[PDB]
Amino acid sequence: MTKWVLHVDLDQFYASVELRRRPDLRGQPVIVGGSGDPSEPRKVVTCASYEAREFGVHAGMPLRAAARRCPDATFLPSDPAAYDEASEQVMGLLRDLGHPLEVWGWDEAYLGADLPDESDPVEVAERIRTVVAAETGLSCSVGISDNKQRAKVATGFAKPAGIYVLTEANWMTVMGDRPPDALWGVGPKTTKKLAAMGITTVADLAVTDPSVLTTAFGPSTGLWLLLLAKGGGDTEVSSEPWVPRSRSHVVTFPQDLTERREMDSAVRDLALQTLAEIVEQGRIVTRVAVTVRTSTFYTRTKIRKLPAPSTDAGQIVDTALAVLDQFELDRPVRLLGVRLELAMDDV
DNA sequence: CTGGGGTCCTAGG
DNA sequence: GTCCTAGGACCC
Ligand SMILES: Nc1ccn([C@H]2C[C@H](O)[C@@H](COP(=O)(O)NP(=O)(O)OP(=O)(O)O)O2)c(=O)n1
Ligand SMILES: [Mg+2]
Ligand SMILES: [Mg+2]
């Protein structure tokens, strides 16, 4: 009788996984990134525990910066296979509730629920938090609404370890005075372009004439931003499996490369690694992109389409190296990367 | 000093 | 109304 979308987001996800094996660290600053050595150059924070975030540490910070901003933190190496495994357990549990479940990356999911009168979406969200914790030792937060975008926005108010409802009744009261980048997919550059037209809040955006937004942003985007400002969004939760569009690997080197021999050999090794992973997942490559970053932090990406979709190793390597060859490589190289775009024709 | 992994969209020769 | 790459803008 009442249709709800619940958005589950795991709490301090990488840190919470680490905390399962180190329960003595609960309540203490913990910082996941690199190899656990905070003096290591060219490594950053992947996840800071809530306690560490109070010192201003946050994902993407250099570990040496972080250690200097939270000297008593315990530094743990990033363990991806453990986060992957913990994700799968989380999705596998959420699926068994008998509601449509749309997974998004490792640590989020949307759930669609049509509730009779006797129930209450808040109490469905508490049994989600309870089932997850009991079975997996992970805490999560749950935002509630009638569309995905607004539920996801609610989840930021539910953090940490909580539940929050955001609907047409409180959308204006709660987020009207907030800047437009409180909305999903509006960031700093859209914000700046909005500020230029005199729009500095959600409520201001919500009442903007459509043709100002359609002229500035396109006839479908401009209306979408209106919709977002008014608290609307996607209402369908599809259980259909996500098909990745690409896969990539990049490596920042412990010291910058100057031998071209080594740059080639690294791109060749990244192309081979990425290809074997997509072939294992049953995929076919369509385009091949190479990324190069110098010691300047000068970074560019070039891409080329295969004549036809293929999985051929010798062809994809030659293509990547060919694309590599289109860069002037007269500066030391800090990073190299390869990305393989993938066919989405027939699964 | 400044990681690694993604998506979606528009500008444009 | 083509088929292509570049790259901006976000996000986890
Ligand atoms: N720049 C970033 C952002 C997130 N991540 C990883 C680490 C996070 O634990 C994971 C989930 O992203 P997230 O949900 O934005 N933050 P997280 O779960 O750590 O904390 P809260 O959701 O409770 O705020 O993606 C990363 O590797 N690099
Ligand atoms: Mg999270
Ligand atoms: Mg998340």
Coordinates of C-alpha atoms (C1' of nucleotides) and ligand atoms in Angstrom, one line a residue:
Chain A
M1 CA 0.0 0.0 0.0
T2 CA 2.9 2.7 0.4
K3 CA 5.9 2.4 -2.0
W4 CA 9.4 3.2 -0.4
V5 CA 13.0 3.2 -1.6
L6 CA 15.6 2.4 1.0
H7 CA 19.2 3.2 0.4
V8 CA 21.7 1.2 2.4
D9 CA 25.3 2.5 2.8
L10 CA 27.9 0.7 4.8
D11 CA 29.6 2.7 7.6
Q12 CA 33.3 3.6 7.2
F13 CA 33.4 0.5 5.0
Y14 CA 37.1 -0.5 4.6
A15 CA 37.8 0.5 8.2
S16 CA 34.8 -1.6 9.5
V17 CA 36.0 -4.7 7.7
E18 CA 39.5 -4.2 9.2
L19 CA 37.9 -3.8 12.7
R20 CA 36.4 -7.3 12.5
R21 CA 39.9 -8.7 12.7
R22 CA 41.0 -6.0 15.1
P23 CA 38.1 -5.5 17.5
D24 CA 40.5 -3.9 20.1
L25 CA 40.7 -0.9 17.7
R26 CA 37.0 0.0 17.8
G27 CA 36.6 3.5 19.1
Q28 CA 40.3 4.4 18.1
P29 CA 41.6 6.3 15.0
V30 CA 42.3 3.8 12.2
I31 CA 43.5 4.7 8.8
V32 CA 43.5 2.3 5.9
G33 CA 45.7 2.9 2.8
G34 CA 48.9 1.8 1.0
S35 CA 50.7 -0.8 2.9
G36 CA 50.2 0.4 6.5
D37 CA 53.4 2.4 6.6
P38 CA 52.5 6.1 7.0
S39 CA 55.9 7.4 6.0
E40 CA 55.6 5.7 2.6
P41 CA 55.6 8.3 -0.2
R42 CA 53.0 8.2 -3.1
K43 CA 50.4 6.4 -0.9
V44 CA 47.1 7.9 0.3
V45 CA 44.3 7.2 2.6
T46 CA 41.6 4.9 1.3
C47 CA 39.4 5.0 4.4
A48 CA 39.7 6.8 7.8
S49 CA 37.6 5.7 10.7
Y50 CA 35.1 8.2 12.0
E51 CA 37.5 8.8 14.9
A52 CA 40.3 9.7 12.5
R53 CA 38.1 11.9 10.4
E54 CA 37.6 14.2 13.5
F55 CA 41.3 15.1 13.0
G56 CA 40.5 16.0 9.3
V57 CA 41.8 12.8 7.7
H58 CA 39.8 11.8 4.8
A59 CA 40.0 9.4 1.7
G60 CA 42.7 10.6 -0.8
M61 CA 44.9 12.3 1.8
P62 CA 48.7 11.5 1.6
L63 CA 49.5 9.1 4.3
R64 CA 52.4 11.3 5.6
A65 CA 49.8 14.3 5.9
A66 CA 47.4 12.0 7.6
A67 CA 49.9 10.7 10.2
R68 CA 50.8 14.3 10.8
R69 CA 47.2 15.2 11.4
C70 CA 46.4 12.1 13.5
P71 CA 49.6 10.8 15.1
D72 CA 48.1 8.2 17.2
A73 CA 46.2 6.4 14.4
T74 CA 46.9 2.7 13.7
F75 CA 47.7 2.5 10.0
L76 CA 46.5 -0.7 8.2
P77 CA 47.2 -1.8 4.7
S78 CA 44.4 -1.8 2.1
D79 CA 43.1 -5.3 1.7
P80 CA 40.8 -5.4 -1.4
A81 CA 40.0 -9.0 -1.5
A82 CA 38.7 -8.8 2.0
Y83 CA 36.4 -5.7 1.1
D84 CA 35.1 -7.7 -2.0
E85 CA 34.3 -10.7 0.1
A86 CA 32.6 -8.5 2.8
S87 CA 30.6 -6.8 0.0
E88 CA 29.3 -10.1 -1.4
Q89 CA 28.2 -11.3 2.0
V90 CA 26.4 -8.0 2.5
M91 CA 24.6 -8.2 -0.9
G92 CA 23.9 -11.9 -0.3
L93 CA 22.1 -11.1 2.9
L94 CA 20.2 -8.1 1.7
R95 CA 18.9 -10.2 -1.4
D96 CA 17.3 -12.7 1.0
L97 CA 14.9 -10.1 2.4
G98 CA 12.6 -10.8 -0.6
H99 CA 12.6 -7.2 -1.9
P100 CA 14.1 -5.9 -5.2
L101 CA 17.7 -5.0 -4.6
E102 CA 19.9 -2.9 -6.8
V103 CA 23.5 -3.1 -5.8
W104 CA 25.8 0.0 -6.5
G105 CA 29.5 -0.7 -6.2
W106 CA 30.7 -2.5 -3.1
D107 CA 29.1 -0.7 -0.2
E108 CA 25.7 0.6 -1.4
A109 CA 22.3 -0.8 -2.4
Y110 CA 18.8 0.3 -3.1
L111 CA 15.8 -1.7 -1.9
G112 CA 12.2 -1.3 -3.1
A113 CA 9.5 -2.0 -0.6
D114 CA 5.7 -1.7 -0.8
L115 CA 4.5 -1.6 2.8
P116 CA 1.1 -2.4 4.3
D117 CA -0.2 0.0 7.0
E118 CA 0.8 -2.1 9.8
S119 CA 4.5 -1.7 8.9
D120 CA 6.6 1.3 8.8
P121 CA 9.7 1.9 6.6
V122 CA 11.7 3.0 9.6
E123 CA 11.2 -0.4 11.2
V124 CA 12.1 -2.2 7.9
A125 CA 15.3 -0.1 8.0
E126 CA 16.1 -1.2 11.6
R127 CA 15.8 -4.9 10.7
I128 CA 18.1 -4.2 7.9
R129 CA 20.7 -2.6 10.3
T130 CA 20.1 -5.5 12.8
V131 CA 20.5 -8.3 10.3
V132 CA 23.6 -6.9 8.8
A133 CA 25.3 -6.2 12.1
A134 CA 24.4 -9.7 13.7
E135 CA 25.5 -11.6 10.6
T136 CA 28.4 -9.6 9.3
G137 CA 29.7 -7.4 12.1
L138 CA 29.4 -4.4 9.8
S139 CA 27.3 -1.3 10.6
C140 CA 25.2 0.5 8.0
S141 CA 23.0 3.5 7.6
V142 CA 19.7 3.6 5.7
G143 CA 18.1 6.6 4.1
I144 CA 14.3 6.4 3.1
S145 CA 12.3 8.1 0.5
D146 CA 10.2 7.4 -2.6
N147 CA 12.9 7.7 -5.2
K148 CA 16.7 6.8 -5.3
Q149 CA 18.2 10.3 -5.4
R150 CA 16.3 11.5 -2.4
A151 CA 16.9 8.3 -0.5
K152 CA 20.6 8.6 -1.1
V153 CA 20.5 12.3 0.1
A154 CA 18.7 11.0 3.2
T155 CA 21.4 8.6 3.9
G156 CA 23.9 11.4 4.4
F157 CA 21.7 12.6 7.3
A158 CA 21.3 9.0 8.7
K159 CA 25.1 8.6 9.1
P160 CA 26.5 7.3 11.3
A161 CA 24.7 4.1 12.3
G162 CA 21.2 5.5 11.7
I163 CA 18.1 5.9 9.7
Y164 CA 16.5 9.1 8.2
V165 CA 13.4 9.7 6.2
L166 CA 13.3 12.4 3.5
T167 CA 10.0 12.9 1.5
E168 CA 7.9 15.7 0.0
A169 CA 7.0 16.6 3.6
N170 CA 10.4 17.6 4.7
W171 CA 12.4 18.1 1.5
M172 CA 12.0 21.9 1.4
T173 CA 12.5 22.4 5.1
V174 CA 15.6 20.2 5.3
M175 CA 17.7 21.0 2.2
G176 CA 16.3 24.3 0.7
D177 CA 19.1 26.5 2.0
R178 CA 21.8 24.2 1.1
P179 CA 24.1 24.8 -1.9
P180 CA 23.2 23.0 -5.1
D181 CA 26.1 20.4 -4.7
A182 CA 24.2 18.9 -1.8
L183 CA 22.4 17.1 -4.7
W184 CA 23.7 14.1 -6.3
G185 CA 25.9 14.7 -9.4
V186 CA 26.0 18.5 -8.9
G187 CA 29.6 19.3 -7.9
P188 CA 31.7 22.4 -7.8
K189 CA 31.7 23.3 -11.5
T190 CA 27.9 23.1 -11.9
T191 CA 27.7 25.0 -8.7
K192 CA 29.9 27.8 -10.1
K193 CA 27.9 28.0 -13.3
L194 CA 24.7 28.1 -11.2
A195 CA 26.1 30.9 -8.9
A196 CA 26.7 33.0 -12.1
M197 CA 23.0 33.0 -12.8
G198 CA 22.2 33.9 -9.2
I199 CA 21.3 30.4 -8.1
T200 CA 23.1 29.5 -4.8
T201 CA 20.7 27.1 -3.1
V202 CA 18.5 24.1 -3.8
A203 CA 15.3 26.2 -3.3
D204 CA 16.7 28.8 -5.7
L205 CA 17.3 26.0 -8.2
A206 CA 13.9 24.5 -7.6
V207 CA 12.1 27.7 -8.8
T208 CA 14.4 28.5 -11.7
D209 CA 12.8 29.0 -15.0
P210 CA 13.3 25.9 -17.1
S211 CA 14.5 27.7 -20.2
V212 CA 17.4 29.3 -18.2
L213 CA 18.5 25.7 -17.3
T214 CA 17.7 24.2 -20.7
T215 CA 19.7 26.9 -22.5
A216 CA 22.6 26.5 -20.2
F217 CA 22.8 22.8 -19.7
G218 CA 20.8 21.1 -22.5
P219 CA 17.1 20.3 -22.8
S220 CA 17.2 17.0 -20.9
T221 CA 19.9 17.9 -18.3
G222 CA 18.4 21.3 -17.5
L223 CA 15.1 19.6 -16.6
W224 CA 16.8 16.9 -14.7
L225 CA 18.5 19.4 -12.5
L226 CA 15.1 20.9 -11.8
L227 CA 13.8 17.5 -10.9
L228 CA 16.7 16.9 -8.6
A229 CA 16.2 20.3 -6.8
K230 CA 12.5 19.5 -6.3
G231 CA 13.5 16.1 -4.6
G232 CA 12.5 13.8 -7.5
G233 CA 14.5 11.0 -9.0
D234 CA 14.5 7.4 -10.3
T235 CA 11.8 5.3 -8.7
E236 CA 12.4 1.9 -10.1
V237 CA 14.7 -0.5 -8.3
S238 CA 15.9 -3.1 -10.8
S239 CA 17.4 -6.3 -9.6
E240 CA 19.1 -6.7 -13.1
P241 CA 22.8 -7.4 -12.9
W242 CA 25.3 -4.5 -13.5
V243 CA 27.4 -4.9 -16.7
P244 CA 30.7 -3.0 -16.3
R245 CA 31.5 -0.8 -19.4
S246 CA 35.2 -0.8 -18.9
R247 CA 38.1 -2.1 -16.7
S248 CA 41.3 -0.4 -15.9
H249 CA 44.6 -0.5 -14.0
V250 CA 47.0 2.3 -13.4
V251 CA 50.3 2.2 -11.5
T252 CA 52.1 5.2 -9.9
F253 CA 55.8 4.1 -9.8
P254 CA 58.1 4.3 -6.6
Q255 CA 60.4 6.3 -8.9
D256 CA 59.5 8.1 -12.1
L257 CA 60.5 6.2 -15.3
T258 CA 62.8 7.7 -17.9
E259 CA 63.6 4.6 -20.0
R260 CA 61.0 4.2 -22.8
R261 CA 61.8 0.5 -22.6
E262 CA 60.2 0.5 -19.1
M263 CA 57.2 2.6 -20.1
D264 CA 56.3 0.2 -22.9
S265 CA 56.8 -2.8 -20.8
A266 CA 54.5 -1.3 -18.0
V267 CA 51.7 -0.5 -20.5
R268 CA 52.1 -3.9 -22.1
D269 CA 51.9 -5.5 -18.6
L270 CA 48.8 -3.4 -17.7
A271 CA 47.0 -4.3 -21.0
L272 CA 47.7 -8.0 -20.5
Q273 CA 46.5 -8.0 -16.9
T274 CA 43.3 -6.1 -17.7
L275 CA 42.6 -8.3 -20.7
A276 CA 43.0 -11.5 -18.8
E277 CA 40.6 -10.2 -16.2
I278 CA 37.9 -9.2 -18.7
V279 CA 38.3 -12.6 -20.6
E280 CA 37.8 -14.3 -17.3
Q281 CA 34.5 -12.3 -16.9
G282 CA 33.5 -13.3 -20.4
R283 CA 33.9 -9.9 -22.0
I284 CA 35.2 -8.6 -25.4
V285 CA 37.2 -5.4 -25.8
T286 CA 36.0 -2.5 -28.1
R287 CA 38.5 0.3 -27.4
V288 CA 41.8 0.7 -25.7
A289 CA 42.9 3.8 -23.7
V290 CA 46.3 4.6 -22.4
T291 CA 46.9 7.3 -19.7
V292 CA 50.3 9.0 -19.1
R293 CA 51.2 11.2 -16.2
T294 CA 54.5 13.0 -15.9
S295 CA 56.6 14.1 -12.8
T296 CA 54.8 17.5 -13.5
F297 CA 51.4 15.9 -12.7
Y298 CA 50.7 16.5 -16.4
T299 CA 48.2 13.8 -17.3
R300 CA 46.6 12.8 -20.5
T301 CA 44.6 10.0 -21.9
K302 CA 44.3 8.7 -25.5
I303 CA 42.0 6.1 -26.8
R304 CA 41.6 4.0 -30.0
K305 CA 38.8 1.7 -31.2
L306 CA 39.7 -1.8 -32.4
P307 CA 38.6 -2.4 -36.0
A308 CA 36.2 -5.0 -34.5
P309 CA 35.5 -6.2 -30.9
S310 CA 38.3 -8.7 -29.9
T311 CA 40.0 -10.5 -27.1
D312 CA 43.3 -10.9 -29.0
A313 CA 46.3 -10.3 -26.7
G314 CA 48.9 -9.4 -29.5
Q315 CA 46.4 -7.0 -31.2
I316 CA 45.5 -5.2 -27.9
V317 CA 49.1 -4.8 -26.8
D318 CA 50.1 -3.4 -30.1
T319 CA 47.2 -1.1 -30.0
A320 CA 48.1 0.2 -26.5
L321 CA 51.8 0.7 -27.3
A322 CA 50.8 2.4 -30.6
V323 CA 48.6 4.8 -28.5
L324 CA 51.5 5.1 -26.0
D325 CA 53.7 6.1 -29.0
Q326 CA 51.4 9.1 -29.7
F327 CA 52.5 10.9 -26.5
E328 CA 55.7 13.0 -26.5
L329 CA 57.6 11.1 -23.8
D330 CA 60.4 13.6 -23.2
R331 CA 59.6 14.0 -19.4
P332 CA 59.9 11.6 -16.5
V333 CA 56.7 9.5 -16.2
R334 CA 55.1 9.2 -12.7
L335 CA 52.1 7.0 -13.8
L336 CA 50.9 4.9 -16.7
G337 CA 47.5 3.4 -17.1
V338 CA 45.3 1.3 -19.4
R339 CA 41.6 1.0 -19.7
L340 CA 39.7 -1.5 -21.9
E341 CA 36.2 -0.5 -23.0
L342 CA 33.9 -3.3 -23.3
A343 CA 31.2 -4.7 -25.6
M344 CA 27.6 -4.3 -24.3
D345 CA 25.8 -5.9 -27.3
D346 CA 24.7 -9.3 -26.1
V347 CA 25.6 -9.5 -22.4
Chain B
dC1 C1' 53.3 16.9 -2.1
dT2 C1' 49.4 15.0 -4.8
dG3 C1' 46.1 6.5 -5.3
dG4 C1' 43.1 3.5 -7.8
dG5 C1' 38.6 2.3 -9.9
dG6 C1' 34.7 3.8 -12.2
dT7 C1' 30.3 6.3 -15.3
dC8 C1' 28.1 9.6 -18.3
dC9 C1' 28.0 13.2 -21.1
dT10 C1' 29.4 17.2 -24.6
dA11 C1' 32.5 19.4 -27.6
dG12 C1' 34.3 18.8 -32.1
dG13 C1' 37.6 17.9 -36.1
Chain C
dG1 C1' 22.4 12.6 -38.7
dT2 C1' 27.9 9.7 -39.6
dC3 C1' 31.5 7.8 -36.6
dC4 C1' 35.4 9.2 -34.1
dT5 C1' 38.4 10.9 -30.1
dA6 C1' 39.2 14.4 -26.1
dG7 C1' 38.2 15.4 -22.0
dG8 C1' 35.1 17.7 -18.3
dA9 C1' 32.6 16.6 -14.3
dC10 C1' 31.4 13.6 -10.8
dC11 C1' 31.7 9.9 -7.8
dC12 C1' 33.3 5.6 -4.6
Ligands
LIG1 N1 38.2 8.6 -2.8 C1 37.7 7.4 -2.2 C2 36.4 7.3 -1.7 C3 36.0 6.0 -1.2 N2 36.9 4.8 -1.3 C4 36.6 3.5 -0.7 C5 36.8 3.5 0.6 C6 35.5 3.5 1.3 O1 35.5 2.8 2.5 C7 34.5 3.0 0.2 C8 33.0 3.5 0.4 O2 32.9 4.9 0.1 P1 32.0 5.8 0.9 O3 30.8 4.9 1.4 O4 32.1 7.1 0.2 N3 32.8 6.1 2.4 P2 32.9 5.0 3.7 O5 32.1 3.9 3.6 O6 34.4 4.7 4.2 O7 32.3 6.1 5.0 P3 30.8 6.6 5.2 O8 29.9 5.9 3.9 O9 30.2 6.1 6.5 O10 30.7 7.9 5.1 O11 35.0 3.3 -1.0 C9 38.3 5.0 -1.9 O12 39.1 4.1 -2.1 N4 38.6 6.3 -2.4
MG2 MG 29.9 4.0 2.9
MG3 MG 29.3 4.4 -0.6

